[PDB]
Symmetry: D3
Subunit: 66 residues, 6 copies
Amino acid sequence: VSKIRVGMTQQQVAYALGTPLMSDPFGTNTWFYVFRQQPGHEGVTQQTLTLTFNSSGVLTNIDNKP
Amino acid sequence: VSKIRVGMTQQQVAYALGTPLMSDPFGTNTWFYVFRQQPGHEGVTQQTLTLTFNSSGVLTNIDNKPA
Amino acid sequence: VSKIRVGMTQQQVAYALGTPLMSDPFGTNTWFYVFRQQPGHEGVTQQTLTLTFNSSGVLTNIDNKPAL
Amino acid sequence: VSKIRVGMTQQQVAYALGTPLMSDPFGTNTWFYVFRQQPGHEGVTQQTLTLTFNSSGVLTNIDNKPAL
Amino acid sequence: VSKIRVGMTQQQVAYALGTPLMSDPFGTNTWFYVFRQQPGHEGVTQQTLTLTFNSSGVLTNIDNKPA
Amino acid sequence: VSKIRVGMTQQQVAYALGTPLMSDPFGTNTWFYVFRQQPGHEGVTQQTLTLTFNSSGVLTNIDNKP
């Protein structure tokens, strides 16, 4: 924590402390859902969803898995 | 168990599905650390850190409250 | 690990092992909700709620973000 | 939400909103460690540790899994 | 920041990297639920559930302790 | 919780309660790492690792991202 200073880039902070446990999802390019402890789950593997957004915050790819 | 389509904004997707469990931290403005399971913890409350970055990804505020 | 002993205070245990991944919320003074993967979310930041309780486990402060 | 009020007990708040995603570990009676993404892990199940504290925040029970 | 190679067993990978943050629950023997942020919670402790499944994926023990 | 009974398959339980918050990683086919709050992080995106194991518990694929 003394390992960081105002003016550092996200790369410099992440090098010092690691990436954070949480961050705000708005403005970022990738959102990942894992649908746990939600009734109605189906299949032989954990349902997940990866969403890709462009720099304007618009959804460009929907990746279901499976 | 709900409907999205390409071209939706993040507000539309969050209304439909909720915010995601995880998202990529690079490019956003607020990072939040909670230092768990790390030896050397001190104090009477859980140590945390909130960082604010500007539109360019540079750190402008370090909030260690506590405290 | 072997670096903890019965009789230790929560500070000593937290200095040896760090705080735990999880703990029972009853009896503590601060609760933190993060409303994720819940349809109906609104706004331009992640909705959260920080509740402060006194010693008697009574709620004394409600802190919504964003502000209601 | 609007379904909580200052003066509520932790039970009333938990009935209205559920327990929180996170809480401050200090002051509670049970801590639970899950040692993941930590090099050195051994054995055939996930290593965990459950610590029980009394009212004074003093450790009274250590429960390692698997058993040491 | 540590070294794995194809052909390693899960014990070898866990020694090198630790266990993973997440894994697929299907096919294993122990499931653990912690019911957070769900309205209608009752009791003086966090409600949890530990389920044991046999090698075939069938439920053989329901542990609701608490209690 | 009264929604489940001994003898149900993992598919029946997951349909009633959802998948669990946690499960034991040994014996399963996919392990996912997200290296957060670990100093030394590098890059312009969150480092992760997906490992695939066969039914004998042997590592068959290493997928770094990026």
